Design a binder for these strands. Structure first.
Ligand SMILES: [Mg+2]
Ligand SMILES: [Zn+2]
Ligand SMILES: [Zn+2]
Lengths: 39, 133, 147, 56, 49, 263, 67, 394, 137, 32, 113, 48
RNA sequence: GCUUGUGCUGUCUUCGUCCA
């Protein structure tokens, strides 16, 4: 393929952002559901 | 020059919906049964309950296009703190000695209830109200 | 994206548009009367969430049937140093004086539609006629007349 | 289709916009539409100079 | 597309039915003559083979 | 009588305070700096070859928006006021860009630093594209792969932002007066309490907050105006301010000349 | 398609900060922090860089039509 | 549809490719500026030009013979601005007064005396509006049995073309009969009336341009006390519906004459839910301040009504399909998320959330069903109405 | 998988939170008190999947009146964007391409599979809601 | 190490002079 | 297609004067001035300078249409003074104010640099 | 017939100085020249 | 001695625009 440097950088950014989203959004949702449950 | 003078005590101050306009009700100290209802601008002339006001009515300010007053010239308004100009839209010849005069100062309304003796001269087209405190 | 369509009525230059205290001018001014009758509350919620996202560098999640509330977005906006309900103090472009009312102000996603005035404008004085009826032809492309 | 209603000449169509600075009985017309449409004016001694200016 | 045509049109075939839930979009429909007759598949819908 | 006080100063932005001036004067100064200060920008593009993936008018529009150095643009003439044939050295600056990708792999970026000044006014500091540093590459113009070349010749002319926004020296001018709302020029929308629902201005500490027992002063007028002028690099901030003042003076002098000549 | 030269709303030059933005995102900075580092204060300018999609990278994958 | 759909205008040649209209003529044409197009016809003879200018001209069409009332009025932000500018606590300084007076084409060059002369000269908005009203006009209206001192600034009194009291709004400068437009048309003729439209629009547009008006998300948000009251009302109504359900399921329900048990039960439940939505909306609308923008637009009469405020802030209410609650399209239920034989309000199409709060998926689907009903009804009845109109004309 | 005919015999929970038994800003869920207990057989994967391709572009559709959702579903197919990335090698009768497409700041989760972030059809404009000069009525 | 490895009392000393579920981090390739 | 040239906002035609003054006979000592190829920038400045003069009794301006670059000013002065002289005095006064403002700005910039 | 019809021309004076065009109509001195970039045709005297 | 040329299909189908 010989990918460009900008495209490879964007792919790395996308992988990091996907991992960070999958952690943080899930943790926030768990905190929200436990708070709604304890009420 | 002037058409009516008296001194009133404010019984009530009703602010209502407005932030800059209040409706005051007053009765003459000297001669009872002479009531005054008036809308005034709070920002430029604030009044409180039980204050004493000197209300004067005149058909002219002397001693058609408006212009800012020169400092050199002088008029009746120099002696007072609050001056308004309106039009009389109703002169009510009611009971034996119950006379109502309705004036509108650009939408700010006034009703002066009194006897024919005092308010006989108020049958004009326009009136100035000069207020001192 | 909420069924609010419209056409450009006029264009103003940079110095004629109203501006905020930090110098931001809108790309677009729409009338307040479009909102109450059509009840597009999602337009205002989207504008508020987009303002928060552009300030913080995130993308707002506008999926339906979620736990998002207007007050959480308002708290986030307030923490960033803005009025929590999306209002701003604005100044008149012509005079530089403050406006007595504050203006709802923020980014909204708009789209350009295929209907442009220069593809629709059409006038005819005289021109081609039909062979059978000797009446003007139909269609703007054929230089036709109106019925 | 051809007697009770028909297609006619000397007509124009375009999108409409609002104008707060127009009178109630006024309509704003694009310059291209004004160039396309015409009115036949009779030459008299009250308007011959204006009409020949238009012709020039 | 539902081939019922223009002649003999009625509200009932054009209506959004209870059984349409999760199978066709409740919002996307053309305006005018084909209102309610042209439908669009929901996002997780499938057709049996 | 008018006073100027400078808070922060930089090449590309100045934050000042104007006092003892009318609101109309400050607003007219803001408008003049936004729309009427002349600069230099590319106006004609001759394309000799363009085999990139971008349309010709796309690249022309991008070229128009590149800020050029306009320090000596006051000594230049307007193209319509120049008696010369075609374009000369006294009313235009000629720039040339030639880019190509060598090799069969990779991509080449075309930056505004690749624009080379070929001709212009003698000894005037005009024409060169603005650059933040010596190692800065500038604005990204296009991208090229193998066998794709761009070869253009641009002509920079003098103009103002009234004709097109590419000639504007400023980006945004912050403008503000009366942070504590003593003049009551705005009426604050609120739900419970207006005081705690509205953020404080950034100049709120520069003025004394009103006393609780104070009454409204109806004789007051706006007196102190805070403004920040941000420039695109084509001119320095002080240059923009001075030339805005000069442009306003020239407009007023033209009005006075027309009045005196009317007799 | 390619990063705009100027911000649409105010006209600040944002066309020289795309590669620095990608570099900062590569280093691990958050998007808001990266925009803060590039001195983009007004959200009108932050919108320009935050919402840009680089379509020219897809257009460049097709073979050139002239050689 | 009627003879005011074709009117004769005067040409003004202008740049750009659109036709331009005064906004007061958009009502007889039933036009708006979201993509509409209009046709123009040029007369080709002196007689035809005279016919157009003396019979079909716009000023001659202000009053329609259909209901002997005007068809053109003050609309949109001019209506909102004329309500805002004629409030009792609106005051204007001398410089802005000079600008607004110069904006009036029919102004005679004489500046009126200010309402307040000392300590600072201030004019009111009623004076500046009265400048645009021709002299010799008398109008008097009574609202809610108000007296001649008008404590709430309602009613109307104009003497010699000068406003004495009363907020000018839809009831005065709208298209209704007996208002200012009708009086000016009868007293002074069509030309003066058209100039009145232009004068009012110019003054109000300048004042509104320099004052401002907006709307935001915060204008649909009621405080916590009102939300508690609305929630209590809706819960009490749902308990009442539950009691009605129990009574109908134990043969203790009164039968409305001329209707079956099921029909009476459905009508009584629908009446209860309608009363619930009305009560919640009335609470929400009473909560609103005067500075609320939705309230200002509704009070001006320029856009919106009570139901819009009710649905945005308090409760969307009950969704009706064919004049009845949501039917059982499945086997004895409306959706597969409910159990069989469920007559509760939420099971049959009652939306208890507002638009600000957000709908649940069941409520979303029921609301979509009702909207689809509306679209089908319009697009089906149009052809029958057109055919009836053609037969009547022929 | 279940079709419309088999749906008449099943009991579906709307959310996984529904499987287990006073804020003025949060929406209110049905009580479902008519039955003492509920034995669900199925659960929805996500309720927002009842929408189609065109209605998945609307942000917050549950805060809108439904005719406006229908109008947006109609109009979103007439927006100008980038229909394909190979528009240069194609010879179509008509084609419109936007200079600077931008992805929306407010997005839905269904936009991920519609490729809307890679081929967007609009721009984020700064919008004020105001009666400025009467030219936006 | 990171903020998580910091002692809770020292984390309490980091006072601004929590993430929310509806603020995603932007992507470029998406999925599907 | 029907869009006017952008340079028409500020370039004055050969046959169009920059300034046309006519009297307003309704009130004494009033003139109507028509400014061509100008906008709010000059109008507001001149108006609010003139409004502070004791011998100026009326001053106003209006831009009739935003698509045309012109404005019209109405000016009325006292019996002794002529309106044109007041306009010239206003122009000279604003020029002097801008001159001292520029001087002080240059002084402060040199101090702070 | 003028020898300048359908020929590339350049404008040397006025508000369109230095713009390349093509002569389309030439009756009396007022040559009609289409402009290469602005999609429009403008009148111009032959002197320019 | 050399002169500037003078017009347009039909019939269906589909998709759309503004009202209703
Ligand atoms: Mg329409
Ligand atoms: Zn030259
Ligand atoms: Zn910006």
């Amino acid at each position: 393929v010989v990918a460009s440097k900008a495209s490879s950088s964007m792919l790395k950014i996308d992988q990091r952002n996907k991992k960070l989203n999958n952690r943080f959004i899930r943790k926030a949702e768990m905190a929200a559901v436990e708070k709604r449950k304890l009420r | 020059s002037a058409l009516f003078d008296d001194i009133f005590t404010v019984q009530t101050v009703d602010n209502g919906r407005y932030n800059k306009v209040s409706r005051i009700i007053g009765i003459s100290t000297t001669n009872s049964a002479i009531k005054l209802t008036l809308d005034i601008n709070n920002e430029m002339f604030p009044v409180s309950q039980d204050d004493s006001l000197t209300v004067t009515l005149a058909n002219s300010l002397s001693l058609k296009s408006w212009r800012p007053p020169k400092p050199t010239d002088k008029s009746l308004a120099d002696d007072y703190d609050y001056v308004m100009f309106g039009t009389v839209y109703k002169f009510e010849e009611g009971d034996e000695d119950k006379i109502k005069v309705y004036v509108s100062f650009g939408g700010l309304l006034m009703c002066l209830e009194g006897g024919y003796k005092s308010l006989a001269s108020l049958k004009q087209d326009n009136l100035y109200i000069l207020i001192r405190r | 994206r909420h069924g609010q369509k419209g056409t450009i009525g006029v264009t103003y230059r940079h110095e004629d548009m109203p501006f905020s205290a930090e110098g931001i001018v809108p790309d677009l001014i729409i009338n307040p009367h479009a909102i109450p009758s059509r009840m597009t509350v999602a337009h205002l919620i989207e504008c508020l969430l987009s303002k928060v996202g552009s300030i913080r560098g995130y993308e707002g999640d506008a999926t339906p049937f979620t736990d998002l509330t207007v007050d959480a977005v308002s708290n986030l906006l307030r923490d960033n140093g803005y009025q929590s309900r999306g209002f701003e103090v604005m100044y008149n472009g012509h005079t530089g004086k403050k406006l007595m009312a504050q203006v709802f102000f923020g980014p909204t996603y708009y789209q350009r539609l295929r209907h442009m005035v220069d593809d629709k404008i059409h006038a005819r004085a005289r021109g081609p006629v039909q062979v059978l009826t000797r009446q003007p032809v139909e269609g703007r492309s054929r230089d036709g007349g109106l019925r | 289709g051809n007697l009770m209603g028909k297609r006619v000449d000397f007509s124009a169509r375009t999108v409409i916009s609002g104008d707060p600075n127009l009178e109630l009985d006024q309509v704003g017309v694009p310059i291209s539409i004004a160039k396309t449409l015409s009115y036949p004016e009779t030459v008299t001694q009250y308007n011959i100079h204006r009409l020949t200016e238009y012709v020039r | 597309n539902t081939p019922i045509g223009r002649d003999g049109k009625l509200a009932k075939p054009r209506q959004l039915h209870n059984t349409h839930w999760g199978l066709v979009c409740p919002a996307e429909t053309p305006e005018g003559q084909a209102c309610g007759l042209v439908k669009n598949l929901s996002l997780l819908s499938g057709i049996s083979i | 009588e008018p006073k100027v006080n400078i808070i922060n100063a930089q090449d590309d932005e100045v934050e000042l305070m104007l006092s003892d001036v009318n609101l109309s004067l400050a607003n007219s100064l803001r408008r003049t700096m936004l729309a009427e200060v002349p600069t230099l920008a590319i106006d004609l593009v001759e394309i000799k070859m363009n085999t990139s993936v971008l349309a010709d008018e796309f690249i022309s529009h991008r070229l128009g928006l590149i800020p050029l150095v306009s320090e000596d643009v006051e000594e230049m003439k307007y193209s319509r006021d120049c008696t010369c044939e075609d374009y000369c050295d006294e009313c235009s600056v000629v720039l040339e860009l030639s880019a190509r990708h060598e090799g069969e792999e990779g991509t080449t970026d075309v930056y505004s630093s690749s624009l080379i000044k070929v001709s212009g006014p003698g000894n005037l500091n005009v024409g060169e594209p603005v650059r933040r540093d010596d190692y800065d590459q500038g604005i990204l113009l296009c991208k090229l792969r193998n066998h794709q070349e761009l070869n253009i010749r641009c002509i920079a002319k003098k103009g103002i932002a009234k004709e097109h926004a590419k000639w504007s020296p400023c980006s945004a001018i912050a403008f503000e007066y009366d942070p504590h709302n003593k003049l009551k020029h705005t009426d604050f929308w609120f739900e419970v309490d207006a005081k705690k629902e509205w953020p404080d201005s950034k100049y709120a500490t520069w003025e004394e907050p009103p006393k609780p027992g104070e009454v409204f002063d109806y004789k007051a007028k706006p007196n102190r105006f805070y403004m920040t002028v941000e420039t695109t690099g084509s001119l320095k901030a002080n240059q923009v301010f001075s030339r805005g003042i000069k442009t306003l003076q020239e407009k007023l002098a033209n009005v006075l000349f027309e009045l005196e000549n009317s007799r | 398609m390619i990063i705009p030269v100027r911000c649409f709303s105010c006209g600040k030059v944002v066309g020289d900060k795309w590669d620095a933005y990608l570099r900062l995102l590569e280093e691990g900075k958050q998007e808001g922090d990266a925009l803060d580092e590039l001195k983009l204060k007004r959200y009108c300018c932050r919108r320009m860089v935050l919402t840009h999609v680089d379509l020219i990278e897809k257009f460049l994958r097709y073979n050139p039509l002239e050689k | 549809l009627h003879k005011m759909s074709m009117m004769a205008h005067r040409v003004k040649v202008m740049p750009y490719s659109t036709f331009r209209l005064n906004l007061s003529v958009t009502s007889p044409y039933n036009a708006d500026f979201d993509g509409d197009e209009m046709n123009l016809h040029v007369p080709q003879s002196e007689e035809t030009r005279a016919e157009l200018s003396q019979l079909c001209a716009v000023p001659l069409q202000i009053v329609s013979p259909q209901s002997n009332k005007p068809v053109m009025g003050i609309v949109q932000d001019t209506l909102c601005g004329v309500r805002k500018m004629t409030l009792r606590d609106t005051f204007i300084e001398y410089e802005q007064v000079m600008n607004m007076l110069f904006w009036v084409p029919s102004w005679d060059g004489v500046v009126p005396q200010p309402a307040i002369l000392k300590p600072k000269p201030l004019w009111t908005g009623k004076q500046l509006l009265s400048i645009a009203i021709p002299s010799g006009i008398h109008l008097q209206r009574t609202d809610g049995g108000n007296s001649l001192l008008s404590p709430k600034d309602n009613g109307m009194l104009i003497v010699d073309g000068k406003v004495m009291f009363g907020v000018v709004d839809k009831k005065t400068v709208g298209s209704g009969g007996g208002g200012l437009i009708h009086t000016v048309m009868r007293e002074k003729g069509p030309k003066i009336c058209a100039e009145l439209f232009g004068n009012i629009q110019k003054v109000v547009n300048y004042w509104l341009l320099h004052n401002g008006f907006s709307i935001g998300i915060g204008d649909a948000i009621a405080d916590a006390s009102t939300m508690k009251e609305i929630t209590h009302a809706i819960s009490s109504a749902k308990e009442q519906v539950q009691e009605i359900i129990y009574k109908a399921q134990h043969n203790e329900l009164e039968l409305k004459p001329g209707m079956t048990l099921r029909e009476s039960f459905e009508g009584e439940v629908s009446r209860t839910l309608n009363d619930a939505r009305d009560s919640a909306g009335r609470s929400a609308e009473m909560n609103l301040k005067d500075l609320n923008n939705v309230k200002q637009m509704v009070s001006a009469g320029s856009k919106g009504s009570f139901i819009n405020i009710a649905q945005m802030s308090a409760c969307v209410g009950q969704q009706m399909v064919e004049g009845k609650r949501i039917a059982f399209g499945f086997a004895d239920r409306s959706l597969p998320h409910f159990t069989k034989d469920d007559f509760s309000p939420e099971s049959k199409g009652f939306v208890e959330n507002s638009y600000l709060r957000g709908l649940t998926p069941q409520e979303f689907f029921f609301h979509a069903m009702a909207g689809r009903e509306g679209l089908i009804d319009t697009a089906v009845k149009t052809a029958e109405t057109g055919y009836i109109q053609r037969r009547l004309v022929k | 998988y279940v079709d419309g005919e088999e749906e008449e015999t099943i009991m579906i929970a709307m959310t996984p939170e529904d499987l287990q038994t006073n804020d003025t800003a949060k929406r209110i869920k049905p009580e479902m008190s008519t039955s003492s207990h509920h034995t669900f057989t199925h659960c929805e994967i996500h309720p927002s999947m009842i929408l189609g391709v065109a209605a998945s572009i609307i942000p917050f559709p549950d805060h809108n009146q439904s005719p406006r959702n229908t109008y947006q579903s109609a109009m979103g197919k007439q927006a100008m964007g980038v229909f394909l990335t190979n528009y240069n090698v194609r010879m179509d009768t008509m084609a419109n391409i936007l200079y600077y497409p931008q992805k929306p700041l407010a997005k839905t989760q269904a936009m991920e599979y519609l490729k809307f972030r890679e081929l967007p059809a609009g721009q984020n404009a700064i919008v004020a809601i105001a009666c400025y000069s009467g030219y936006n009525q | 190490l990171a903020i998580e490895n910091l002692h809770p009392d020292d984390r309490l000393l980091l006072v601004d002079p929590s993430p929310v579920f509806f603020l995603r981090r932007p992507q470029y390739v998406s999925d599907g | 297609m029907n869009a006017p040239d952008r340079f028409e906002l500020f370039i004055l035609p050969d046959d169009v004067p920059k300034l046309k003054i006519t009297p307003d006979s309704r009130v004494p000592n009033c003139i109507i001035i028509k400014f061509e190829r100008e906008d709010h920038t000059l109008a507001n400045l001149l108006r609010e300078e003139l409004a502070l003069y004791p011998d100026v009794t009326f001053v106003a301006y209006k831009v009739e249409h935003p698509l045309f670059a012109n404005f019209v000013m109405r000016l009325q002065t006292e019996e002794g003074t002529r309106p044109k002289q007041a306009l010239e005095r206003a122009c000279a006064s604003i020029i002097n104010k801008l001159k001292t403002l520029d001087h002080k700005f240059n002084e402060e910039w040199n101090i702070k640099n | 017939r003028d020898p300048t019809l359908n020929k590339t021309v350049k404008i040397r004076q006025g508000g369109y100085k230095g713009k390349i065009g093509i002569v389309k109509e030439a009756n009396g001195d007022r040559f009609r020249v289409e402009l290469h970039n602005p999609n429009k045709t403008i009148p111009i005297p032959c002197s320019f």
